Design a protein around this nucleic acid. Structure first.
Ligand code: SAH
Ligand code: MG
Lengths: 55, 301, 386, 268, 79, 46, 58, 108, 216
RNA sequence: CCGGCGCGCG
């Protein structure tokens, strides 16, 4: 039963892109001491063809 | 005595099959008259049922477009005359009547042998005229219905001929009250007052289902008994009761936690188990001490 | 934990959760249109003698109050048998707070062992009471009494000595916590004779009640008035619906009484205060079925509406306009409850068969060959001359 | 109807899709052979219509009016079963067909092979044929009744001597939903003026004109009054409030288009 | 589905080639599993859904939907 | 959607120009749904 | 089609001239159910084909 | 079959002797739950053809007798044991048939 | 048998509730009448609670702005018009606002009459920068939708923001059946199920009086 | 299951 049981990037970073038709699918932006990076926010299931990640 | 009254301000019987009535209803709050008027008009024009002949059986007729020797009117004219007979009845079902006369003479609506549950509105309604003494036997079918539809007869069941209403300002804008008038025209099968009362009752029966219990609320006349039968069956081959049928009332919780769960729309044990700790933490007056004590209480169960 | 008490205020209904149990029934008069009754006598069922029950149990009032959007809790005892568990579940799914319901494993729900004396005329001399008669003073849930703002109880709880003591304790505890005490008389069957012993039984609880609801028959019985009106006659004369002056209800008044409600079903409700008095006319031409003839659903709905309106605005118990609006709301609630019960139970035709109002108003085809409504063979015709 | 749908008479549909209905009958073991299925179809059994409705889903048809003057004279639609004996046609595709409802008729064709069905679905449907090939103007533009409705809706307030009998020497709404709700409760008319609080950028089409009147307060705040909006500014703060003078009709048109876009975005 | 069809053509240089490829894929689907198509499942709809699903956008299989409010067997919705 | 707020009138020329601009900006699939909604609104107000 | 010695090709019906939700778009006509169950516009039509008399063929 | 019996006939029946359980129905003609209980009792008497006896006593005509039995309302059933040693059961309300069968098979 | 059920429910925020309800089986023409009556009742016969009047104490000089408050008087009134309340009050009561000084004044800073609650405590009213006590005397009423230097507030009593009905028809031959769908949007002061029940009760109460009879 | 003539509808 449900009851018995690197940092995230600045949201404005993606928000300024998002309001301008930038779309990121299945990935999230993370920041570390080395710098920015893109990481899969979930499990990307391998499909028949290439999958769209960002636009 | 009543602050809001209704009365018949005019009643008129223009003919045997055309009654008139005007009714008043004041004082009404602003906007109530429009709702009452539109709902009452739609109920009068669509929700009131009537009785009429729907099927007539002949014996020696090739088709409904033929003549009979000795009767001035053809079969089609006889059927058209039969379609105009206005009847009244409070019961449902396909009753049957009989026309069994010998000529010559005039066949009026008082020549129909009716079952005790059906009455004739107009005795003088014409069906056919017999010029010579020929036998004539017609078997009829009568049922009560709404709207409109052995030779079939296109029966129009609506007994209200027309309706109208008007809304007038009561006066000074203390509460901006209103006056409602309703005009009803019927065919004599029921008076305009009877039509008004029947429309009110039909509207209430149309709106009252929403005040029942929601579909799939009790376990499936007396909703208690099926659940008792379920409990009896569960007593044999002991399998206990499902968590959905067990409520948080029967679990010993502190009153604050009980109220917290209740206003969060948590009622049954299955809902409690489906809930997560984070969501309960999101709800105020519910600290980690409450979480752990509730978990201990559930573990004790 | 006063900050967790929300809106509307909680109401505690103290008593028994019976299933279709009627205390009593007295001859009654209702407002009716008799031209319609004559016209629709073949399609609308009516009782030959109009007899009205004052209401039902406390569980019924708790269920009715919850259906109005109010907050209701039931205080009582139920057994662990199948009947008791079923009744508890039925109360639970009706949004009635059952945390104040005490469950006893040593008691049987709705069953009492009775010792009949077989020497003279049979008495019954109750020995072991039922489950919903054995609520001890220690089993009273005090938390719901603190949370609740109004306490409701009936006279059925005063029939047993232990039940009477528990009821007195609960009333006193609620009074200490600043609650409004609602006493719904609903006079049981054995108490309708020997007015004196009824007064002896109900004198103490009567003085501890802020709001009291009685029927017209109950008020006449308690005031020693013989009904002079006529019953079961096709008219609506004002003598059948008389608004007694406050002098008539003067002997029944006490220091802490705020409102007295005298109900005549949903036809008329009379309210009495120390400064205002009046009546509100209603409607009792609701669909009635042989399964719903006692009209107890109307009484439960009326009481539930009165409780709801008194709890939502407790500072207007003396406002005449608010009392009139409360009476009208109670009339409407009773009418709706009676209509719903008529639809649910249906007409007579667990062995329980019922037919709908549509089936009840369906006649036979009258297609009997011997009948005068069928084309007989030409041998037997019997033409009538025009 | 939707822009991509048409209504087919039951008799025409059962005639055109007869083989597919036969296959649907045989496939679910409700017909022993082809002859039994054809006999069942001929008897108009109630189960024939279930199979017809099932097999018409996803199978397009081609409609065609008689004088095919350009390529938009034949288009593809998704057929649905309608009662009666007439073909139900969308009002917005009548201009391309040059069709009016005073006696005109149309022919219906069923693409059989998969390639033809794909061609009809991906090339001939009306939602990818919104522009005319002659010059590029839109072809499914509202006309006549819709045009009059929009014109009346967006016809603004009566102004000047048509609004007041004498020389003058309106409700304020927090949001458009409040204004439309007041309109529903008959508090205001369709063309009664009102002030709408604007919480977006200045995007109201109006004449490029300076304010009629500027009401400058000694505390710093000044009110700029234009012909169609009021703007409140201050010298102390960076606040900027905008109120648009409009009617319920303009708000309704804007909300209709905005809600169409938002609903289409959410549904995908 | 109209939005999906528009989106799929945003990556196609030639729409005629897109239609031909969709038809070929639907033909392969029908030849491989003949009995699964023609009723509630259409081969072209399945191809379009799979092509949309291949991009990572979840869609119902072949855009197949029914009415949960049908009042039992035999009852046909009237438009 | 960054739509301009028309506040004067919508005539035959304006609706034709508006639809053409919507196709360029939003595409034929979006505009096909906008046309369906606008058609109902125009019918409902007539 | 002749009443009282006059040509009578039609009926006198109550009529309004207004747009109604697009159901009279272009040249469409919206009518009431009263014209149907009242048999206002019912006509007899007879074909000829080169069977029991009074039978309902199908 | 349920027979309407007066106060004195019930007096005689209980003061007499019997080998089968006796169920007494306390009812009134103005109660709907009384009609529902009558239907339940008729079904039960169908189930118990001769091994039990079900009788009905009208409360409105035997009000003093009903008070003597501490009948606090309607519907009310009394299960009278044939053995004088055992105690009688008074049931209040519209109880289900399974409770009736359980009483008759356990404490009868 | 004629039954009803909730087929969809949502809570987008604390002041945006949605629900979809069903009612079947119905006869021909009944669903349209029921939907029309229910929509009218939902839109105008349901009582709502709103602030209808505001009195500005502490001598604001009856000017457009008050020293220390970021928002103007008109802006404050517009903010007050947006506060969603629920109550059972009969007549008219009074509410008060007393915020000590700097900070944000929200709905939470309103002292309410007994039966009045606040749906959203985060609704902004005014912003205070300098330490000046602000005294506003609110007037709260409960009214139907279809119904001294104190500034009025043009309150619109619409607890149900929107309502719609739709009809689905089915049939196999000569027997038909239709289904009624009702959509209700409320501002959180009342649930869509509560709105449905209240609309039904108000309609029934509107049609009870036609069955009234009088004493002879 | 073929062609002419006449009358119509969009
Ligand atoms: N695999 C890798 N390991 C370490 N640094 C990398 C790398 N790939 C790219 N970079 C660094 O990242 C830069 C590319 S821009 C990439 C994001 C950048 N790190 C930022 O935070 O903004 C290059 O200058 C390179 O120095
Ligand atoms: Mg044409």
């Amino acid at each position: 039963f449900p009851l018995f049981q690197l940092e995230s990037a600045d949201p404005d970073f993606y928000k300024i892109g998002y309001v301008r038709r930038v779309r990121a699918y299945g990935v999230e932006f993370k920041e570390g001491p080395d710098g920015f990076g893109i990481y899969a926010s979930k499990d990307i299931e391998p499909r028949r063809r290439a999958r769209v990640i960002m636009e | 005595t009543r602050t809001l009254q209704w009365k018949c301000v005019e009643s008129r019987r223009d003919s045997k099959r055309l009654y008139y009535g005007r009714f008043i209803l004041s004082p009404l709050m602003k906007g109530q008259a429009d709702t009452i008027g539109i709902a009452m008009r739609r109920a009068l024009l669509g929700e009131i049922e009537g009785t009429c002949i729907t099927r007539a059986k002949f014996e020696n007729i090739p088709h409904d477009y033929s003549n009979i020797v000795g009767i001035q009117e053809s079969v089609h004219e006889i059927l058209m005359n039969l379609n105009e007979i206005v009847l009244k009845s409070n019961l449902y079902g396909t009753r049957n009547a009989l026309i069994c006369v010998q000529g010559p003479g005039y066949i009026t609506a008082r020549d129909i042998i009716l079952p005790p549950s059906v009455e004739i509105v107009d005795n003088t309604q014409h069906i056919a005229t017999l010029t010579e003494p020929i036998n004539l036997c017609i078997g009829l079918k009568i049922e009560r219905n709404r709207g409109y539809s052995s030779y079939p007869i296109d029966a129009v069941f609506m007994p209200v001929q027309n309706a109208n209403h008007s809304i007038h300002s009561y006066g000074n804008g203390n509460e901006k009250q209103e006056i409602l008038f309703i005009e009803i025209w019927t065919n004599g099968s029921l008076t305009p007052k009877e039509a008004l009362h029947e429309a009110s009752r039909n509207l209430i029966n149309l709106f009252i289902p929403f005040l029942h219990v929601e579909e799939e609320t009790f376990y499936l006349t007396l909703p208690l008994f099926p659940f008792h039968n379920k409990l009896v069956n569960l007593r044999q081959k002991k399998k206990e009761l499902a968590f959905q049928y067990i409520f948080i009332d029967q679990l010993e919780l502190p009153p604050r936690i009980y109220n917290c769960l209740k206003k969060s729309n948590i009622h049954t044990l299955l809902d409690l188990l489906n809930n997560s700790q984070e969501d309960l933490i999101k709800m105020e007056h519910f600290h980690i001490e409450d979480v752990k004590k509730l978990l201990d209480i559930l573990e004790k169960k | 934990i006063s900050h967790t008490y929300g809106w509307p205020p909680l109401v505690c209904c103290f008593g028994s959760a019976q299933h279709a149990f009627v205390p009593s029934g007295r001859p009654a008069n209702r407002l009716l249109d008799y031209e319609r009754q004559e016209r629709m006598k073949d399609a609308v069922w009516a009782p030959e003698k109009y007899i009205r029950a004052p209401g039902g149990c406390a569980g019924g009032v708790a269920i009715a109050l919850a259906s109005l959007g109010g907050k209701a809790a039931f205080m009582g005892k139920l057994g662990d048998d199948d009947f008791g568990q079923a009744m508890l579940y039925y109360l639970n799914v009706c949004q009635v707070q059952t945390r104040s319901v005490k469950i006893d494993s040593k008691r049987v729900t709705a069953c009492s062992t009775m010792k009949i004396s077989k020497r003279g005329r049979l008495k019954s001399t109750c020995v072991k009471p039922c489950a919903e008669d054995s609520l001890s003073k220690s089993e009273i849930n005090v938390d719901v009494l603190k949370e609740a703002k109004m306490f409701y109880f009936t006279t059925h709880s005063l029939l047993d000595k232990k039940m009477m003591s528990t009821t007195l304790q609960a009333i006193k505890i609620s009074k200490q916590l600043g609650n409004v005490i609602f006493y719904d008389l609903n006079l049981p069957l054995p108490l309708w004779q020997s007015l004196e012993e009824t007064k002896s039984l109900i004198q103490e609880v009567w003085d501890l009640a802020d709001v009291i609801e009685v029927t017209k028959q109950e008020l006449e019985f308690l005031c020693g008035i013989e009904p002079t009106e006529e019953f079961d006659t096709k008219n609506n004369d004002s003598s059948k619906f008389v608004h007694y002056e406050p002098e008539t209800v003067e002997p029944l008044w006490h220091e802490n009484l705020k409102i007295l409600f005298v109900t005549n079903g949903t036809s008329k409700i009379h309210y009495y205060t120390k400064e205002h008095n009046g009546a509100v006319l209603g409607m009792e031409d609701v669909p009635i079925t042989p399964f719903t003839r006692d009209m107890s659903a109307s009484g439960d709905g009326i009481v539930a509406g009165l409780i709801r309106m008194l709890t939502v605005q407790p500072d207007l118990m003396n406002d005449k306009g608010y009392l009139e609006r409360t009476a009208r709301y109670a009339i409407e609630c009773g009418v709706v409850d009676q209509w719903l019960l008529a639809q649910t139970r249906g007409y007579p035709p667990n062995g329980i068969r019922s037919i709908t109002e549509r089936e009840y108003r369906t006649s036979k085809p009258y297609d009997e060959p011997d009948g005068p409504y069928v084309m007989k063979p030409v041998e037997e015709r019997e033409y009538r001359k025009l | 109807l939707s822009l991509h749908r048409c209504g087919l008479p039951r008799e025409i549909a059962i005639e055109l899709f007869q083989t597919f209905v036969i296959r649907g009958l045989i496939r679910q073991h409700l017909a022993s052979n082809i002859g039994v299925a054809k006999s069942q179809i001929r008897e108009k059994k109630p189960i024939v219509w279930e199979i017809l409705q099932e097999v018409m889903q996803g199978h397009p048809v081609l409609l065609n009016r008689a004088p095919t003057l350009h390529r938009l004279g034949i288009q593809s639609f998704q057929p649905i079963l309608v009662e009666g004996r007439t073909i139900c046609l969308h009002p917005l595709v009548c201009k391309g067909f040059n069709a009016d409802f005073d006696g005109d008729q149309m022919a219906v064709h069923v693409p059989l092979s998969l390639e033809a069905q794909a061609e009809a679905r991906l090339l001939m449907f009306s939602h990818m044929n919104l522009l005319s090939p002659a010059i590029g103007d839109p072809i499914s533009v509202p006309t006549q009744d819709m045009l009059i409705g929009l014109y009346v809706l967006t016809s603004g307030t009566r102004r000047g001597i048509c609004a007041n009998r004498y020389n003058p020497c309106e409700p304020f709404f927090c949001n458009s939903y409040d204004a439309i709700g007041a309109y529903r409760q008959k508090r205001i008319n369709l063309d009664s003026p009102l002030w709408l609080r604007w919480q977006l950028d200045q995007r109201v089409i109006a004449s490029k004109e300076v304010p009629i009147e500027v009401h400058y307060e000694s505390f710093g705040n000044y009110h700029e009054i234009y012909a169609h909006y009021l703007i409140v500014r201050s010298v102390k703060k960076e606040t900027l409030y905008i109120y648009i003078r409009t009617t319920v009709g303009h708000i309704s048109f804007y909300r209709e288009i905005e809600e169409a876009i938002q609903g289409f975005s959410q549904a995908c | 589905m109209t939005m999906d069809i528009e989106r799929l053509l945003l990556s196609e240089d030639n729409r005629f080639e897109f239609v031909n490829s969709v038809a070929a894929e639907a033909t392969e689907y029908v030849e491989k599993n003949r009995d699964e198509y023609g009723g509630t499942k259409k081969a072209i709809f399945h191809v379009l859904s799979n092509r949309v699903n291949d991009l990572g956008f979840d869609r119902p299989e072949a855009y197949a939907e029914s009415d949960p409010y049908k009042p039992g067997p035999g009852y046909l919705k009237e438009y | 959607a960054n739509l301009v707020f028309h506040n004067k009138v919508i005539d035959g020329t304006a609706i034709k120009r508006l639809i053409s601009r919507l196709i360029d900006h939003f595409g034929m699939a979006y505009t096909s749904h906008i046309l369906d909604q606008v058609k109902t609104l125009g019918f409902q107000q007539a | 089609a002749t009443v009282g010695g006059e040509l009578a090709l039609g009926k006198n019906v109550l009529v309004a001239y207004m747009p109604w939700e697009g159901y009279n778009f272009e040249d469409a006509v919206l009518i009431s159910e009263c014209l149907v169950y009242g048999d206002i516009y019912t006509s007899f039509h007879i074909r000829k084909y080169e069977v029991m008399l009074g039978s309902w063929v199908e | 079959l349920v027979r309407k019996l007066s106060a004195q006939e019930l007096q005689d029946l209980v003061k007499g002797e019997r080998k089968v359980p006796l169920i007494v129905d306390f009812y009134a003609t103005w109660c709907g739950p009384c009609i529902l209980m009558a239907q339940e009792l008729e079904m039960l008497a169908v189930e118990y053809e001769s091994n039990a006896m079900i009788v009905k006593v009208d409360t409105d005509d035997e009000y003093e007798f009903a008070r003597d039995m501490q009948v606090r309302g309607l519907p009310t059933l009394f299960f009278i044991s044939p053995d004088p040693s055992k105690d009688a059961i008074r049931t209040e309300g519209l109880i289900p048939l399974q409770m009736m069968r359980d009483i008759i098979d356990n404490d009868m």
